[PDB]
Design a protein around this nucleic acid. Structure first.
Ligand SMILES: [Mg+2]
Ligand SMILES: [Mg+2]
Length: 337
DNA sequence: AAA
């Protein structure tokens, strides 16, 4: 296993500014780490008792100031992620999917969700928020049968925290948001709508709290998609093909459909060839977006050496040496007040 | 949970 290379994009700055790093990582929850989907990885290496060590080691060694995780299993949050990262100087916020859904005690422990951790020496938690996409869809369906049938029926969520950035690093506020969108490629419309919902709800948090945004997400969307275009260009045509020409009027409950932020992906221009890496599918579907008005990217952690993967005949993850089917993103950012 |  060779070290992943750091890529410098700009060096540190004279003007007073704070730099900090952000990790975005889908850990692959145990529930979904099955032989069926991951036949090519041996059982002992899929198993959570084994994989959780590689996943902790990954998060520890990245050592980011802000960590956004997806597929964090409820019980693992409280008994593993939080108490171990507390020992490293972090506090955290977590919310599970499916909160409103009836299920046994046992099943409730295994439901996964999104978590944001932050170094308490650098940041103070001002507010925490959960955005349940099923609920925002319900509230915004009026008319539109697609909303209710296609969107409200997906249990996805994002979380967001409002953080106070300690003055000494330079009340400076920062919002960090983390989401995990629906997966199914036949549902490009749900992915885009969940993103519009997440962004507009994030804007609302912002009002009630101009203020820098860091947006981490497993978007399940390629760089060419309607969702990436929407996030990167401040908006998208209400007739974009990703709507499956299937919405209109209800779309602009979150509003050519537009958002106010000015965002760039930390890894734009293909700095990694894929963030999800399996036998059947490899592509960039995970992202760290930041407000380009307040922040520059100083650098990113580059991809694992493609030559190393080929030499070891690794055509999909997880693998004995790679504990998730996603690779972590890690970026260093510089914030100007 | 690019079931
Ligand atoms: Mg997954
Ligand atoms: Mg995914």
């Amino acid at each position: 296993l060779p070290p992943r290379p750091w890529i410098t994009l700009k060096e540190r700055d004279i003007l007073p500014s704070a730099s900090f790093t952000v990790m975005c990582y889908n850990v692959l929850c145990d529930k979904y780490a099955t032989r069926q989907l991951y036949g090519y990885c041996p059982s002992w290496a899929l198993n959570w008792e084994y994989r959780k060590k590689g996943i902790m080691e990954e998060i520890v060694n990245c050592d980011a100031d802000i960590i956004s995780l997806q597929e964090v299993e409820t019980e693992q949050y409280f008994t593993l992620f939080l108490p171990a990262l507390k020992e490293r100087g972090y506090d955290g916020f977590f919310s599970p999917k499916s909160r409103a859904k009836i299920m046994s005690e046992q099943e409730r422990k295994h439901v996964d969700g999104c978590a944001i951790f932050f170094k308490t020496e650098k940041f103070t938690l001002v507010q925490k928020h959960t955005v349940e996409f099923n609920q925002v869809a319900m509230a915004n369906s009026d008319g539109s049968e697609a909303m209710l049938n296609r969107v409200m029926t997906k249990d996805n969520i994002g979380v967001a925290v409002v953080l106070e950035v300690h003055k000494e690093l330079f009340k400076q506020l920062l919002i960090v948001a983390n989401a995990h969108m629906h997966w199914d490629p036949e549902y490009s419309d749900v992915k885009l709508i969940q993103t519009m919902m997440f962004v507009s709800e994030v804007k609302n948090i912002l009002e009630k709290a101009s203020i820098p945004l860091v947006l981490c997400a497993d978007l399940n969307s390629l760089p060419d998609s309607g969702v990436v275009e929407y996030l990167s260009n401040g908006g998208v045509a209400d007739n974009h093909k990703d709507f499956k020409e299937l919405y209109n009027e209800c779309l602009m409950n979150f509003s050519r459909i537009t958002h106010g932020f000015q965002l760039k992906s930390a890894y734009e221009n293909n700095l990694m060839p894929y963030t999800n890496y399996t036998f059947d599918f490899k592509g960039v579907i995970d992202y760290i977006f930041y407000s380009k008005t307040h922040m520059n990217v100083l650098g990113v952690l580059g991809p694992l050496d493609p030559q190393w993967l080929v030499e070891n005949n690794i055509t999909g993850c997880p693998h004995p040496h790679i504990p998730s089917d996603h690779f972590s993103l890690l970026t260093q950012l510089e914030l100007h007040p």
